[PDB]
Amino acid sequence: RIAALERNAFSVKPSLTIGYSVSRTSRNFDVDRLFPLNADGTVANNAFTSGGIDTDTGAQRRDFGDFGNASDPVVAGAAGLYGFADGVSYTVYFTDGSTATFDGLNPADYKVPTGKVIDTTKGRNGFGFNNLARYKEGSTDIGISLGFDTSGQFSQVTSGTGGSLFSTAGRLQVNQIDLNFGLVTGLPSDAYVDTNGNGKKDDGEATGRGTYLGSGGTAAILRDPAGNVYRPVFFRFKNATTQFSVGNNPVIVTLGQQQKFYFSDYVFDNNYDGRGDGFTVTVDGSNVPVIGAWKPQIKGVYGSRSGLDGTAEAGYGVYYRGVRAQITPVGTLTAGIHYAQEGRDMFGAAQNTTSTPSDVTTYGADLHGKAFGVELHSEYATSRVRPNTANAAVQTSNAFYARVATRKDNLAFDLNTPAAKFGNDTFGVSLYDLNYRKIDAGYNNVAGISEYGYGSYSRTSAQNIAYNPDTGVTAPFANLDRQAYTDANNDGTSDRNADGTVVATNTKIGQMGFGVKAAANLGPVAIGGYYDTSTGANGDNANRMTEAGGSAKVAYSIFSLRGTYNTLDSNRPQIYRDAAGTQIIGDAKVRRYAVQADVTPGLGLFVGAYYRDVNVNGVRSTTDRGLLGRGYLASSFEPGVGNNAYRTGLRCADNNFGTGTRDIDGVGGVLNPAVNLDQSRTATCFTSYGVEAGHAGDNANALVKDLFFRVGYSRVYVPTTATATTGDFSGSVTYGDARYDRKVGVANVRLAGSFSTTNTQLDSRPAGTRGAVGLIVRTDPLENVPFRPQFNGQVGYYTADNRVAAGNYNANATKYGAGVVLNDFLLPQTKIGVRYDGYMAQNRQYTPFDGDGTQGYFSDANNNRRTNLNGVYVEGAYQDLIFSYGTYTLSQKDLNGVEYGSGINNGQPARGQTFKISYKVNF
């Protein structure tokens, strides 16, 4: 009886929040860039951060201000303190009484008055000024909330009797659901009233807190003169279950919304979203008497696209059906056939609009598996698309491939595992890939009824491969397209973007070709080779792209010597930069050959000498323009004895330098415990030659346990002026890195250092000297000295002499930070703590997140400005009551010393102060 009472009882969960807060600022800069970075790269926790960490948009705690109640993001350029503070953002008044906001330090540059608006002289001269000061008037807030949770025992459903011509028994199937429900008192700030059914908040839908006054917030509170507060009670629930399965042994029928299914690639790659609402039936004949050892299986799908959706949507009156059948006659070779169809009904043929084909009918067969020591992967498809309209003129498009290679479990092809193995280690000829491709030009995700895909995933990386992990397009080979200059509006000149990149028009050409990658394992020797030619579907050599190559390695004792030859002959246009540095579209010929020798004495040390020679379009081509990466079979070898693996990808980042110019911390990464500067490569294949010693601390029997350094020298070829055939190895790069953690006593030291003396502009790094050093100390609590002190520390210096074609400017930075925590302070359970941080910078800047996956970074700019961010943060604690105080100042002067901080132009820095009293309480 007690269990029955508990099953359908409410758990009452009240919550109380108590806290005092005051904050005064004049510019709202950011202070999270001063705090130490943890070994996982996260910044140390403080009581002043505004938050804002978003992985989707790349936002971090360092992209927003931390004072007042405002989280104003930092603004790049001069409007912000070069990414250090908030923008100036004048306000512009209009004649009709409307207003706009101008984001700049000079309103005169407001070059965007709308068509009919005229600046009315209402403010200073029609331009106002948005106040840069934010205030949080000191107050103590008590927040009270209450929720009612359920026992969570309603996770099952049992079927009931049904039928009209008959009556089912009932209680035959038990389904596990994922319903999470309870009672809430108040609505979240992000709730809304969805009046359209799209499931998303359109333009100002309802603001559910505004629909139910008194639900939450401060705008409305349903009160009582006696002091009572009333809040509406809502029933909140999530239903994560949309599929219901019936039947156990041979036959299982699943009914639900947005059914996800997969016949094969090129036909019903309809998982990762699903296609619509309906049912799927799966029949497994693995226990049949006569034929059950072949594991016969049948799948059948019926559904309506997107369920019910309004007209003008692609899935209105459109229904899909399909059936697949497969077996495994041999060890693992599964062979299957499948029929798929999608079409409009009489209500979709009329009043649907869009462009969905009147009918698509695809047939196919596949032979994936591993049977007799070899792995086969084949696929055939036929489309027969009915292109709506009136005449239609049904169009057919096939897609066939046959590959002898190893597919992973995620259906991506692993080209590093042979799958042939025609011998042992002494004589070990290994076939890695052997494939043919006949994808037609018109075969897209509509031809074979899928969600996405069947197009080059990169067009710059391996562009014959359609495999797209983002959209779940599991398909080995892609529908290639031909690229050409656009010339949309202007005539005579090709259209370009603002950055100068070309604008291309892509026409699908399909794909047809073959490719073999193999390697023969000798004894102390090993050899490998690859060949690959792909044309358009029609076979015209105007779209051919052939890559051939081969490598040979000899490794013995502690010496290894490799030699690689790579070619790329692309009559296919290809987009790339020329010698001058302007993007172009046109055929390419790349010839590379690299001989690199390595010696490993075994004491953790290593030495490496290399000579790599690129040759683009017949000229020596100081740097290849990424063309060699257009093929998916690169297959270089690796140094070391007994390492005869022919792994795909030309390891161009081997024994060469790094060209990074961005960093999370103020100093050039030498103060970031999540960045190993000695393992930073450029990943660009150069025409150069050089040597590089080093030392690894993770390798056992090393001189120093945790020590890594990467001293190295190199010389890079550069043409005579810009495009001359003649040239010389005039460029010179001398680089060095070091990293040493150690733990002397109770403290935990960490040293990092980097150097560079480049002579030319390699990828984006200018030509000049570049050095950096950083030290991090973190003492554990001392149990001998009174107060149990626990110290910290941080120092970082960065220097760079950027010799760019527009200046010879020096960009240096200096970051420091110290702090001591007293874990035993007078009264019991009393703690005190103080941390002082500082960051000075010459011509450097911060670039905030771009709103995409890219994050913000500190870089060098020629802005003649010196930033002087400083702050002190004192955190004391009684038993569990935390007093946090913080005072920070940001001043950005110029060479003269004008002190542009606090940009009202009064010669005063921006200042921020905060005081908080925090107290966490639980019921």
């Binding site: 009886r1 269990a3 029955a4 156990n248 042994n249 041979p250 226990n287």
Partner: peptide, 27 residues
Amino acid sequence: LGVTRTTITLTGMAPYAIYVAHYHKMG
């Protein structure tokens, strides 16, 4: 075919108690 439904109907048991029943192997 390959599944087993088992209906143990018990009577004269304890008024409102829970009765977890399963299959104990030979041991």
